[PDB]
Design a protein around this ligand. Structure first.
Ligand SMILES: Nc1ncnc2c1ncn2[C@@H]1O[C@H](COP(=O)(O)OP(=O)(O)O)[C@@H](O)[C@H]1O
Ligand SMILES: Nc1ncnc2c1ncn2[C@@H]1O[C@H](COP(=O)(O)OP(=O)(O)O)[C@@H](O)[C@H]1O
Ligand SMILES: [Zn+2]
Ligand SMILES: [Zn+2]
Ligand SMILES: [Zn+2]
Lengths: 379, 179, 410, 188, 48, 48
């Protein structure tokens, strides 16, 4: 047998490499540069025609299997990591591309949350997945994902990128280099997603709960006269060479707060753990609480894990969660690989198990016969 | 334009000798060391300096206007000297292009206003796109396209370059006639 | 390819998936009679090589070395192949002036041998987890095998004989409080030079560092030499074992090297009416062809069609002479002079024939597109023949129709 | 719970309804288009029409297989992973728990009440699911009224109108004197 | 009997390898004929 | 078991066939490599 390849198709970035390795070999933006198109189209797009999606995935998988990885597709197996409740037609297409065009031996559709649990070694743990599109949580108890007690909110990368763009356009101060030393607002109508992502990573950080709670009430201005903490210094960011955008200190520590803002509904990234944990079985409560896992690149943002764990323990004392989750000890697990590449590492650890892989995985001979991929929906 | 090469009428003033046509406008300071064995074209306002050179060019070589081919200086501890470059067979240097390259391979299409760095080797059957910067001491494999300010692998070329490029340079030469 | 706009006039492929591609990109399948696209054909892996130091590495060595060259390095700041400079060696880039001294890597006495990448921090914990799950997976295999052979036997779990060292990993300890964001981040100027961008962060995925001083230069990525193999046909094309510094094909096969290539020599006016002159060069030494067909009525995907090209011309026998010919060497009677065809045929040079197509532009607003079918006598040589020993009359008799789609500039 | 599980399957079709306001239109989608198949396995293998539903904003959503496999979780709650008996089971178990003499008459008189019986082909499925669990050659009549949603109130309206109700209710002065039990003891 | 089934599977797998090798023999043998032609051409071209 | 014995003898014969085929393929590959070396010599002449 040969070392099975692991792929993990995401909206922002795709993880690729081989099984039984310390981390992924290639990690790249999930896009393709088609002739005529100035900006490259995104390879994973939900709610489009199958033929157009088929062509994009055919183009992308080709780049992964030749330019990034150097190996024959037909020779060795595949371990496709994809999140639970991934759209039906997308997963059906992705398999149909691998089985028909590339003619792979067998694909294994592992849920990202159960794979993240294997990397630690613990059999039972709560898993939060703060991705690009949606920040999803799914309790895993001793190998069994509990779909009953699922939770998701659109407070990921996309929702954060959009919030940054909005704030920058309000307090817009750019030095074009054409008598634009004076503050010039909205010279460009929209900012490209590639720039916004680079600003987010380098400039913006996650504030402490004490400082963050003041920032929330400050921008609200709820019958108070200038009750904001002192912001960090303003950082100057180059746009397309000559144009120098002066990023305000307030924007850096306020953009993140949309994730941890209550917004009346009581629906934050913090609340989603406690909302799910309260809905879980009464016996499983204390085991899941003690074993928390925080995967996804959105949680890589500096000082996110401290704010989350703090915001949890504050929301615990709130009267809604005070009865059930009152006297619970919330402890976070530190996975071996980085927060972005926890999902991938599980699939590699699973891919190294050649004996179990072949049995669980769906063979091409079965797919060609039936034409029915197994899912958590009815058969 | 749609596969077919288009007409280009040259003026009376041009040095036509043994097939090799060289525009009189285009200075080539150092005529001794530079050598053009085949039926080469050098368009107006182009430079081929003899700064301790040995500039050998192809059978059907083409260099469009405002374009420079200068040899690079090798930073050697023994002795600092200008390395003699060798342009390959059927080489197409595009307009306004800068070339400080040592050993340019055969059957290559160098793009418009693209700066190739010092001591840069190019292997046969490659293509550099327009508005691109190849840094000093870089190599580009066959059936490749290098682009961007970094100057890195963009993709692969069509399989039939060796056969196709012959038609292009020979057609341009044949189509390029006096008025 | 690019200088002349090959991406204009396209040829169609037959099968499940119909594709419009330039003849330059397409490949002809000789085993059967059907040209197929780079998309349609299956891709293989032959050889690995470094783009800087062109060294053909074997498949086994690549797996050990993680598809990388040991000697060559790529800079982390910008993506370019580094160069060794002495004073006793330091690694430096040409484009950007990033050095190995900047991040604080010590200079090596030996040139290539000294340089290395640090071991992965969670490599020991990795192997322990694999071996735990490997032992645990092996138990499930034995359980699944024992269960399956019991079902196959169909003895209803009949007890003939008596039924029925452990590896235990310790699960990772959960920290009570994770390390808070350092108070430096509050009230400190952020230099964008010091912190690293996402692109250069993600190129080093094993321990993607925020600071630049931590970010080490990764080994240069090895490139691939593609070999094509079809569904119906077996082989198609391939590359030598010394693809480094070579432009030779072990088996040369391409649509332009069999099917007669069409090119638009002259482009007329685009104002509702014109007469366009197109050439039809042959590639084969001795053959016959014809551009008679008008692409039927609403058949063979003529949806792109935005004009009515007549091309009402009978077959014209053209031949290629693989030799350096003079300007009008000899005038052949039966090939050239007999079919004079002054209205139809524009000019007839060596391996060349110009043909006037009567297009009807401005049927839509703009972007004029013409569909026409081209026929050719394909000397397939499918049957066993050594230097054309067999007559190959039935092969030559076979008329292959390629649905061409020419797109005028507009 | 059927509205909650439909939201999950709608995300599996690729339409998110994350907001608490957006939960209300999932309840509207359920109430508009969700039919209970007599055989669930046959309808899954059959290719769906993908019937379009129009949202308040004007946008269209193709529901497809989520339409029928959402309200199935009433009759089979183990599928999602909820430890319960099921709507067919609780009806039969309630009759089987009662004395043997009454079982025949209780099967012969079943009444559907509430809004979560109005699902298209609910009575058709329940009749089939009850028959296989219930004893053979027993008459099973599931007598649904036309006003199932408003049946519970109409009962109270009739009960309230009767002169017997005057005796049944607890007076304000009675609650002050008797104590807390007053409401509990008079309930039945 | 398990040994019989396993040995039958081993023979079947060896036959699958044989069939793959035969397909490769045909395709790469047409390739080798092309390469023989190419080697003749290469000798002629070496002379030239 | 007797049928399986016949099958096993045939399988051993087919394994011998596999050995012969692999030997022929390797020998032809070596001959082609020598021809490629000759071609490389020709290419050196061409470079000169
Ligand atoms: N190393 C990092 N540091 C900070 N932010 C990151 C980092 N890597 C990714 N991100 C951000 O977090 C997001 C993570 O998305 P990812 O989990 O890769 O995608 P998906 O959820 O589709 O699998 C990215 O879109 C990016 O904005
Ligand atoms: N026509 C309908 N079709 C399907 N489901 C319906 C329909 N009408 C109501 N429902 C469902 O039933 C619920 C109404 O329950 P209801 O009968 O009011 O309960 P109760 O008896 O406690 O008052 C709605 O919220 C909806 O989920
Ligand atoms: Zn074929
Ligand atoms: Zn190298
Ligand atoms: Zn650099």
């Amino acid at each position: 047998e040969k070392t099975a390849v692991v792929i993990d198709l995401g909206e922002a970035f795709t993880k690729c490499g081989f099984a039984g390795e310390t981390g992924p070999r290639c990690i790249i933006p999930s896009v393709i540069k088609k002739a005529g198109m100035p900006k490259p189209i995104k390879v994973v797009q939900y709610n489009i025609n199958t033929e157009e999606l088929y062509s994009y995935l055919k183009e992308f998988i080709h780049i992964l299997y030749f330019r990034h990885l150097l190996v024959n597709p037909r020779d060795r197996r595949v371990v496709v990591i994809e999140s639970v409740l991934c759209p039906s037609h997308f997963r059906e297409t992705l398999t149909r591309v691998l089985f028909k065009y590339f003619e792979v031996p067998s694909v294994l559709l592992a849920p990202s949350h159960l794979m993240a649990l294997l990397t630690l070694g613990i059999n039972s743990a709560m898993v939060l997945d703060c991705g690009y599109r949606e920040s999803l949580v799914l309790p895993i108890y001793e190998g069994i994902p509990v779909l009953n007690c699922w939770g998701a909110l659109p407070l990921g990368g996309k929702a954060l990128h959009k919030e940054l763009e909005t704030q920058l356009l309000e307090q817009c101060t750019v030095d074009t280099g054409a008598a634009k030393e004076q503050s010039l607002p909205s010279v460009m109508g929209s900012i490209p997603e590639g720039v916004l992502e680079d600003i987010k990573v380098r400039t913006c950080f996650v504030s402490d709960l004490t400082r963050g709670l003041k920032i929330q009430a400050a921008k609200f201005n709820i019958d108070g006269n200038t009750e904001r903490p002192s912001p960090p210094p303003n950082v100057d960011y180059p746009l397309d060479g000559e144009k120098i955008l002066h990023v305000l200190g307030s924007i850096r520590d306020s953009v993140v707060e949309i994730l941890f803002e209550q917004d009346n509904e009581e629906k934050s990234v913090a609340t989603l753990i406690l909302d799910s944990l309260m809905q879980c079985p009464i016996d499983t409560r204390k085991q899941l609480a003690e074993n928390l896992v925080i995967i996804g690149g959105t949680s890589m943002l500096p000082g996110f894990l401290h704010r989350l764990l703090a915001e949890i323990r504050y929301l615990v004392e709130k009267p809604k969660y005070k009865k059930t989750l009152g006297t619970k000890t919330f402890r976070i697990h530190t996975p071996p690989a980085k927060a972005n590449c926890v999902a991938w590492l599980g699939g590699a650890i699973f891919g190294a198990l050649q004996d179990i892989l072949g049995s669980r995985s769906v063979s091409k001979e079965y797919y060609n016969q039936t034409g029915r991929i197994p899912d958590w929906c009815s058969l | 334009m749609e596969l077919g090469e288009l007409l280009y009428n040259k003026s009376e003033y041009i040095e036509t000798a043994s097939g090799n046509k060289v525009s009189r406008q285009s200075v080539l300071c150092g005529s001794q060391n530079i050598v053009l064995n085949g039926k080469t074209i050098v368009m107006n306002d182009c430079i081929i300096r003899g700064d301790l050179a040995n500039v050998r060019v192809g059978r059907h070589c083409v260099v469009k206007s405002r374009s420079v081919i200068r040899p690079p200086f090798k930073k050697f501890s023994k002795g600092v000297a200008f390395f003699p470059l060798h342009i390959g067979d059927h080489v197409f240097i595009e307009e306004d292009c800068v070339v400080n390259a040592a050993q340019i391979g055969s059957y290559v299409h160098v793009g418009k206003n693209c700066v190739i760095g010092r001591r840069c080797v190019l292997k046969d059957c490659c293509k550099i796109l327009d508005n691109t910067v190849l840094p000093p001491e870089t190599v580009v494999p066959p059936f490749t396209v290098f682009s961007g300010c970094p100057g890195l692998f963009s993709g692969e070329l069509p399989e039939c370059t060796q056969e196709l490029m012959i038609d292009v340079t020979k057609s341009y030469y044949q189509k390029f006639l006096p008025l | 390819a690019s200088l002349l706009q090959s991406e204009r006039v396209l040829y169609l492929v037959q099968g499940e998936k119909k594709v419009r591609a330039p003849l330059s990109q397409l490949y002809f399948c000789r085993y059967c009679s059907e040209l197929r696209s780079l998309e349609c054909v299956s891709h293989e892996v032959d050889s690995h090589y470094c783009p800087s130091c062109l060294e053909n590495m074997p498949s086994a060595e690549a797996k050990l070395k993680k598809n990388r060259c040991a000697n060559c390095f790529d800079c982390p700041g910008c993506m370019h192949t580094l160069s060794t400079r002495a004073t006793a060696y330091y690694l430096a880039c040409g484009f950007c002036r990033w050095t190995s001294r900047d991040v604080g890597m010590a200079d090596k006495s030996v040139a290539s041998g000294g340089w290395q990448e640090p071991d992965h921090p969670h490599t020991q914990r990795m192997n322990k987890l694999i071996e735990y799950y490997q032992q645990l997976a092996q138990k499930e295999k034995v359980e699944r095998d024992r269960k399956k052979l019991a079902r196959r036997r169909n003895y209803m779990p009949l007890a003939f004989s008596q039924h029925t060292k452990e590896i235990k990993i310790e699960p990772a300890q959960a920290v009570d409080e994770v390390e808070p964001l350092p108070e430096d981040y509050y009230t400190r100027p952020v230099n964008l030079t010091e912190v690293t961008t996402l692109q250069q962060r993600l190129l080093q995925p094993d321990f993607q560092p925020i600071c630049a001083s931590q970010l080490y230069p990764r080994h240069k990525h090895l490139l691939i030499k593609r070999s094509l193999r079809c569904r119906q046909c077996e082989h198609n094309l391939s590359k030598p074992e010394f693809n480094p510094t070579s432009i030779k094909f072990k088996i040369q096969l391409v649509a332009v090297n069999y099917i007669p290539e069409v090119r638009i020599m002259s482009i007329p006016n685009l104002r509702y009416m014109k007469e366009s002159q197109v050439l039809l060069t042959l590639t084969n030494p001795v053959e016959n062809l014809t551009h008679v067909t008008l692409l039927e009525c609403e058949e063979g995907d003529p949806d792109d069609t935005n004009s009515t090209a007549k091309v009402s011309v009978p077959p014209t026998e053209l031949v290629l002479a693989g030799k350096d010919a003079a300007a009008e060497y000899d005038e052949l009677a039966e090939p050239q002079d007999f079919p004079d065809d002054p209205d139809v045929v524009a000019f007839r040079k060596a391996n060349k024939v110009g043909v006037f197509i009567k297009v009807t532009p401005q049927r839509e607003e703009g972007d004029v597109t013409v569909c026409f079918k081209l026929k050719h006598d394909f000397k397939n040589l499918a049957a066993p023949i050594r230097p054309v020993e067999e007559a190959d009359p039935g092969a030559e008799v076979s008329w292959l129709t390629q649905h061409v789609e020419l797109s005028l500039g507009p | 719970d059927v509205s909650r599980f439909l939201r999950l399957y709608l995300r599996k079709e690729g339409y998110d309804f994350h907001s608490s306001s957006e939960f209300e239109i999932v309840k509207a989608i359920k109430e508009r288009a969700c039919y209970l198949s007599i055989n669930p396995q046959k309808d899954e293998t059959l290719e769906t029409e993908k019937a379009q539903y129009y949202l308040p904003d004007g946008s269209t959503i193709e529901i497809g297989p989520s339409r029928f496999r959402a309200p199935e979780l009433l009759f089979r709650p183990d599928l999602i992973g909820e430890e319960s008996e099921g709507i067919h089971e609780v009806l039969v178990f309630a009759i089987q728990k009662s004395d043997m003499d009454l079982r025949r008459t209780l099967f012969s008189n079943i009444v559907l009440s509430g809004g979560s019986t109005l699902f298209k082909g609910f009575g058709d499925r329940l009749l089939s699911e009850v028959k296989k669990l219930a004893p053979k050659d027993v008459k099973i009549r599931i007598s649904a009224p036309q006003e199932r949603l408003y049946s519970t109130w109409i009962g109270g309206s009739i009960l309230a109108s009767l002169d017997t109700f005057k005796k049944m209710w607890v007076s304000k002065k009675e609650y002050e004197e008797d104590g807390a039990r007053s409401i509990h003891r008079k309930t039945f | 009997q398990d040994r019989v089934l396993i040995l039958e599977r081993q023979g079947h797998d060896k036959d699958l390898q044989l069939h793959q090798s035969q397909l490769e023999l045909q395709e790469v043998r047409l390739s080798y004929r092309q390469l023989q032609x190419x080697x003749x051409x290469x000798x002629x071209x070496x002379x030239x």
